[PDB]
Enzyme design. Structure first.
Site, short mmCIF file in Angstrom:
data_model
loop_
_atom_site.label_atom_id
_atom_site.label_comp_id
_atom_site.label_asym_id
_atom_site.label_seq_id
_atom_site.Cartn_x
_atom_site.Cartn_y
_atom_site.Cartn_z
N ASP C 103 -49.70 -15.82 11.27
CA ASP C 103 -48.86 -15.45 10.01
C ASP C 103 -49.15 -15.41 8.84
O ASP C 103 -50.65 -15.23 8.88
CB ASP C 103 -48.11 -16.93 10.43
N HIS C 135 -45.23 -20.29 4.77
CA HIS C 135 -43.90 -20.38 5.59
C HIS C 135 -44.85 -20.60 6.87
O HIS C 135 -44.03 -20.71 7.91
CB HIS C 135 -43.99 -18.38 6.05
N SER C 295 -37.72 -16.00 12.41
CA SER C 295 -38.90 -16.86 12.96
C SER C 295 -38.90 -18.30 12.89
O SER C 295 -39.39 -18.55 13.78
CB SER C 295 -39.91 -16.83 11.64
#
Ligand SMILES: [Ca+2]
Lengths: 14, 13, 355
Positions: C103, C135, C295
């Site tokens: 990521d 994120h 996600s």
């Protein structure tokens, strides 16, 4: 026992 | 909304 | 005969950079000789080529920055299977199991994931055209967090494949998956759960790599995608030997994200919570935020699969998939949200831990 909806739904014990 | 502590989130929800 | 492939989603294409994939049993020396042959034949034709990376571990191949004018010639090289043009990818218990997160950069000093996550020296991100770590921190928080985490006892290893804007490349992810394989060969550990909270257009090479890694005994969990579309048109979601996760809300309804929302189809394996997911906020060391997407949904399954494998380490990939399905809440999702013909194909399953 104040567990977030997602943790409650997936069946995690509080 | 950003909560500075875990306890802050609990009083909100 | 060798075939050429490029991303069907035109804006996501990245021309001038190619992944030359060779035949399964090609050796590193053979691959290197082939890259030099390509460099020599191109120079002879007055072309400037740069070999960025040579693949070995999962797929025999190499990465080359060159003109397209050379593709007909590159396709004529020996051992060549296919050549894929690089494309963009976008961001969308458990003790004896290590979770690998491909990521963005992560905030490892966060009081929620402090000690749990090991930031690897691996970084492969395309240039941009707190919020940069946003994120990755939240997903690390959902997977193993102290307060809001699924698999609290699980340890994580983070790889950087997405930039501050949450953008990566197919090749970037390829090099990333290859790095995991090498780390495992150099220092073997136990069960591995690899989380891919990213997606691009259907990619022959990204799927092929996900299939080899899966065949190597590694568990791969991915996001279905936030395009309100058939998940079979997106990679790594379309790779069959992977666990593709869609998102659902508190009201057992598929998540709507503006004009778009969760993906569906015969490629999705199951669904998991994806709307209003509380987790680690990179704003401050104790900060929490609510995020959404496939996600967060995949991160729940990555947590469940960690806990399940920690409890039964001998399980085969096919056996674990049966456990995920067997323990899931059945026929709860509102089928009427998906297109009429996708309903029969989409599995009505919501991920849950055994009681
Ligand atoms: Ca699958």
């Amino acid at each position: 026992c104040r567990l977030p909806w997602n943790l409650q739904r997936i069946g995690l014990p509080c | 909304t950003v909560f500075t502590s875990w306890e802050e989130y609990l009083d909100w929800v | 005969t060798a075939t050429f492939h490029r991303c069907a989603k035109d804006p996501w294409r990245l021309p001038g950079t190619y992944v030359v994939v060779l035949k399964e049993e090609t050796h590193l020396s053979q691959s290197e000789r082939t890259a030099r042959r390509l460099q020599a034949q191109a120079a002879r034709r007055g072309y400037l080529t740069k070999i960025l990376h040579v693949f070995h571990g999962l797929l025999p191949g190499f990465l080359v920055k060159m003109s397209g004018d050379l593709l007909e010639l590159a396709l004529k090289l020996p051992h060549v299977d296919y050549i894929e043009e690089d494309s963009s990818v976008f961001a969308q218990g458990g003790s004896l199991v290590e979770v690998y997160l491909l990521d963005t950069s992560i905030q490892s000093d966060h009081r929620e994931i402090e000690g749990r996550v090991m930031v690897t020296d691996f970084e492969n991100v395309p240039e941009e055209d707190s919020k940069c770590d946003s994120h990755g921190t939240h997903l690390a928080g959902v997977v193993s967090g102290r307060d809001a985490g699924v698999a609290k006892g699980a340890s994580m290893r983070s790889l950087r494949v997405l930039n501050c804007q949450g953008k990566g490349t197919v090749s970037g992810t390829l090099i990333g998956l290859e790095f995991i394989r090498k780390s495992q060969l150099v220092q073997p550990v136990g069960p591995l759960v690899v989380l891919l909270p990213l997606a691009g257009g259907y990619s022959r090479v990204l799927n092929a790599a996900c299939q080899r890694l899966a065949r190597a005994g590694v568990v791969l969990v991915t996001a279905a995608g936030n395009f309100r579309d058939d998940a079979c048109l997106y990679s790594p979601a379309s790779a069959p030997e992977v666990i593709t996760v869609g998102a659902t809300n508190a009201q057992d309804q598929p998540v709507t994200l503006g004009t778009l929302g969760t993906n569906f189809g015969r490629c999705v394996d199951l669904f998991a919570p994806g709307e209003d997911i509380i987790g680690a906020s990179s704003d401050c060391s104790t900060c929490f935020v609510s995020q959404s997407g496939t996600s967060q949904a995949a991160a729940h399954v990555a947590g469940i699969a960690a806990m399940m494998l920690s409890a039964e380490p001998e399980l085969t990939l096919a056996e674990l998939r049966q456990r995920l399905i067997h323990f899931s809440a059945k026929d709860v999702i509102n089928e009427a949200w998906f297109p009429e013909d996708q309903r029969v194909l989409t599995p009505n399953l919501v991920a849950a831990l055994p009681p």
